[PDB]
């Protein structure tokens, strides 16, 4: 087998649980050369109230329907917010525009926020919002066992667990439905 | 089975004490939801984790450099004051390589043509009415009267230079007309213009190649292609110079491995080469490359600069010489206008989608100003003149063949120099035989390549090699003897050794154009042969 | 002519024949009164006070966020449905017969979905010499900004988008005469690389003149600024060095540093405390994976930033490089001839000795009207770089007419060939910039600058306000340039005004009236108390501004920044 | 020093004054309607959308306003 | 020239000459990787594949993306003359290298246009005899048949065989692959008059420099070509037992249109509007010079309808023929509107009335005496004059048949078959065959030119089909004449989609409120099962020009297109307007 002079090879995982490998000198320089634009807008002016405004608007819109009860309005707005947040933060891996030769082709947006530094104020606010939403929704709207269990499941497994530091830089590769995930 | 429960019980007890007040909250939550343990357990867990996360401290990432938290400020001051930098550029070897600056000829108050007057070494020595054999213009079509009149009219109408980038307002109608003319002349759907030819190849290849792609390149190519490969950031393989068996074997291996890997999305692949090489001056075989790219599903990139205006019956490029169609044979073509057409700039030829993507994703096109109008208009006029008549190409081909036949049929030079060029090339290249070089200077090409690679890898500041400098001095001595004893000017290959990556050795070159007469060329050839024999004779 | 609208081709336009006086008035207007000139004074070595920025109310930013979210959602939905169901229309984005496509759809998302909808506002063909009146080609956009159809009709418009600060873009003058004489004597062809053949006395004369003008010891002249920046850095840098650069540098500098291979670190724009902390940490830490001292440390800076229109704190940088034993490199292309009491550049406005900086860069295309670039430094550095560089030995050389144009413009500004022309142009451009900035601030808008920078950015925030404004300016025969999210932060969008030295005062009055009307219609004026020296909100009538601004812009107390 | 080759476009105020359409009885209503329409139109992202989507967005906004009224 | 055998395979298609010598014969390969045509040796023919026989190969055509081969599968015999055999193409096919793939809508539209043209066409050809010429041109050239000596004017498949010609510049082996065809009619029938065998033939050819579809192409262009130009010949052969010589006769006639500038703009009405252009002197002079050089003298017969609608062109044509003042050009006028129930004795009255101007001699024809071996021993008389008919703004066919029948009596007299002073019209079946031949020729030319057929006399009543024909033609003229002209232009080579400047012409581009009128009319009609419907009908018929289906590939002279837009320079729609050069009479 011939060995290339210069190699930049994307390698896939070979196990169910894996951790994305660290970076090299060239990749570190390419990442540090230019300030990222996907993760910069989080800290700008007016980027924290917008979540509260979105939640209030969604609640008011879902309350407008005639036949919907209060419990289902709260459940629908919780569904919408959690699904939107998950799809925006934890599903798409990469950069919409062209960065320095695909240097960020293995990290999501949450791992890109604040240059991978942990326990920053933005992360604190973003992890604090869903818990307050869940608590207010449960307290103001009387639920049943079935709806309460489902809401707890949704909030726990869709909003909080991906934010935990233990799951940072983690990939799950099911040999069935899920395809093999790039590891380097 | 039991360690998990024990650790779960142990964990929250510590953070209960860590929080300034935790027992009151737990008691209140337990009392409020005393009926059901599920709700109070969920609330306690969520609130406690939120609070404990809020109260932590920032933690950076683990980088290559190691932290040093055990240093006192006095030590910090000591290390900061102890640091010693290096000079910006080392001046130790400046005087040794200075002669190559003092040997550069300077034209005085005349256009560059066949007969010029030069001065060297800061007006210390002056030679008049010399015969020029170092120019790089082959057709000399830009010195005629009609092109001069067109240039004067364009300058009177439009001005000297443009004042904007192509993005906002720097693009005019003459540029569009030139693009249309090039696309029609060379038989391709689209073309794109670039301000400088040296910055064309490094700017287009990185646009279409990303990490995880495969590129197969020739054994020896010019420096701009090497820079493009370096900026490409993709896997790069090398195959032997003009050896199709090795190329076929390499493609077979790559295809088999890729098929066995079972990859979801197929990557992008390329084959990078050129026409008449800049350093060797030989021709590349097109039909075999076309057959291989059609068989193994590869694309083709050709960086032809010395073959646009010299090859073919009319001068349409490398494709015309082999009697093929450019639209399907070659995928990406890179050209230049300074060599044969007689004006500055460069161009890239291909289909419509590639041009549409280059107009947005190419750095050298988006972030630079447009070309002046007169160069564009003169190039278009030259293209029309070339389309009308084709006597210049025939004359150039005959002169080049006659020049090559003279230096490759003699017997008195067989033991000293060898010719590595091609009969169709307009430039003739001469090198020293390995036996004579080994006998005289005591080194070979492989040792020089190994030494330079070792120095480049070790990142040593001073890169100075003695035998290479001696050989360059010897070739300069030959050139100076030829210029002093006879009124003939020839040049050697000017390269920078510390920037090259592929093997290379010093050589000598002779140029030609279509405005000469056979008698002068024959006399110049005889004089050059006599000077070479007189200077290089043993003992 | 019965074929439908499906023919797209830019038509070559014949020139218009006019008397000499009308053409000269078209290209360069004459002075109204001797009182419309201002003379700029030196700072005598004082650091720049911290800049003051202004903000709009919250609801504008909230609406911006909502608009961007809606647009992104719609784009993704359209892309998904189209790619999933209608395969035939999108054949250019699919794998055909075992070959991968040229590009992927994810990377080209913003170009296809957001920018394309406004694609008619960016690229506009023109004709004729670009002066204070520029002729534009009439066109109609078919489909939705997909292709255009031209009817071959032209009209003039006042231009505010051309890089000619001192107005040397002329067709009847001494520079054009010199260029024509050069074409008569020298041809338009170049021999080849400057190392083997292609060096004449003109190149040497130009190098000596540039070296004398800038104030350094020796200089070199190239044929392209972008190539100069790209190929300069690898000549004296390696893997053991460090480059600390601003975060708002040009693309060419980043390309050069990427090609060199050195380690890269960046610091926040306008922060000196962060720069000092970064330097102190980097010196101590050392090289990666081995922890050895760095070989050398270089700092890269820009004289004036075009988008922001703010200067760089030079005395502090000189102090830091002198204290910590670092090297400094300065790129100045927007302030080489348009700034300073005489026009030398940043080193003159701050009173800093030119010997303190190590390498100075610049291009001739911004102000002198000719393409090119130069590098200025000491003697031994240039002696080493003349041999170590790759552009000198492998690339082409610069033609004769451009060189003659550059030499003539430099001699005109230096005050040799023409007696009293350079000072008049410098004073004209200074006064024009001050007048426009003060009038726009008094009307109620928001602008950035340093009170003399030729570039004036006016801020628009909502995504839907940037197209219409531009189109309206085309209806009033004014040309403008706007920038958007991929280049500037998400919240802030802006339109750039590039004032020239050929415009007069009455043109500025006409511009002010039309801009005030359009901004009033579109609800664009939103100021505060931080954009005034008194500290109170101001919303002035147009007549009062036009009547009292010209006599008050010459004072230095009315400018907050 | 008083001739050029440009054509000047007069502002809308001077055009209205020349046409003699400064009577207030209908101009007040016209100005109110135009100002309300532009205030509604500019702040929403209608210039970047397509006709098919803009129709549905208009219908949705009209329905919300009418129902809340 | 003979049957071909082709083999389809994953690497392309190979064509070989089925009947030959078995020596080294060229094999034509259509490449699959780059879509090219190449010539190879005999050994490269695939072995394991299946061979398919085809009667003849027409050519290759290059569309926007791929390249296609047009093939004629089977043929049918029509007439046999002097041993030669005439054939008619029955089945057609289009072959592409790719087995299956994705193609854009434009490619599908182009394929549909090609299929539409191939469906409504009738081609004729012969392996040995050359039909693109007449007996004069055949006699002036050697007795061999080749594409080099063919007439470029009736060489219908010219643009399709270009590649097959490029290799054949110096390549005799390729000569056997090129096959000229004609777009017209050809038939021959045999009979016995008085114990002597005779064969009567008829051939009709059509030019290629103009197009058809009636209203779209009329008058002349700058180059002098005339729309609807066709040629007719009525060859005859006779054998006499009482002697040895074999007799061959020939007669020629030409048809065209008035050479003045004029046009008929179509709208939503039964009768369109007539417009006349500017002065025409150069084009008419060049056209008449070409006609004089080719055929010799000319005799212009101008039949016209009633004055009311077709008057203006008559005065212009008389004025131009007077202004030319050419001794070799002679004008004879005739006018009938009084014919009743297809009674045509005034045709004989006119024939008596004719012959007085310049004396059409019955001697003026082509006479040939040929032996049993067919060596063309000796010629007798040659033809030097023709009659040019430009009528019907039916009639031309009736005039031509009568003139040919009148000449045929002298033709029989010169062959010593029947004694002088005897009429040959006595036999019923012979004249029945004659009439059945000319009626079929008339039907063929009428269906080829404009829509359905025309009024037919046959032997020896039919107002129902006659009326239905008018309604069908009225519908076809106003709603289904775009694609026909587009197919003509695409096949003949007028439009070549090989440039990036030209965008797709198929999508509709007229404004929306013009498009919505028919839907509103249909909705009102189906909810009516009245003021809205009346208003919509009035609006539709008040702007007919905007609703007529127009050709798109190649422009027409008498129209202009305006592009409307809003204040922000954005496209809204296009409108059709009458060209300013043409004017109302
Ligand atoms: C019936 C039962 C319930 C059904 C529940 C499902 C309903 C529909 C679910 C919708 C899921 C998808 C919606 C979220 C998609 C978000 C965007 C997709 C693409 C992500 C990558 C884009 C890259 C651009 C980078 C960038 O800087 N973008 C930024 C600007 O350009 C970014 O776009 C802006 O800041 C937007 C500011 C948003 C502020 C907070 C939003 C969080 C709440 C989301 C709830 C969704 C509600 C839907 C109505
Ligand atoms: C009750 C449920 C819903 C959830 C939210 C409760 C607690 C979670 C967050 C707890 C359960 C176990 C915890 C845990 C176990 C072990 C360790 C290792 C230690 O070195 C760092 C903290 C860390 C990583 C923590 C983090 C927080 C975890 C993951
Ligand atoms: C405008 C700009 C350039 C342009 O360089 P050219 O080679 O003249 O096109 C270079 N550098 C900077 C900083 C610029 O702003």
Numbering used by the authors:
A (entry chain A): 39 to 222
B (entry chain B): 18 to 556
C (entry chain C): 1 to 561
D (entry chain D): 3 to 71
E (entry chain E): 2 to 394, 397 to 463, 471 to 539, 562 to 617
Question: Anything the authors wrote about it?
Answer:
Serine palmitoyltransferase (SPT) is the rate-limiting enzyme in the synthesis of sphingolipids. It catalyzes the transfer of a palmitoyl group to L-serine, yielding 3-ketosphinganine (3-KS). SPT is highly conserved across species and consists of two large catalytic subunits (in yeast: Lcb1 and Lcb2) and interacts with a small regulatory subunit (in yeast: Tsc3). Here, we solved cryo-EM structures of the yeast SPOT complex in both monomeric and dimeric states and the monomeric SPOTS complex.
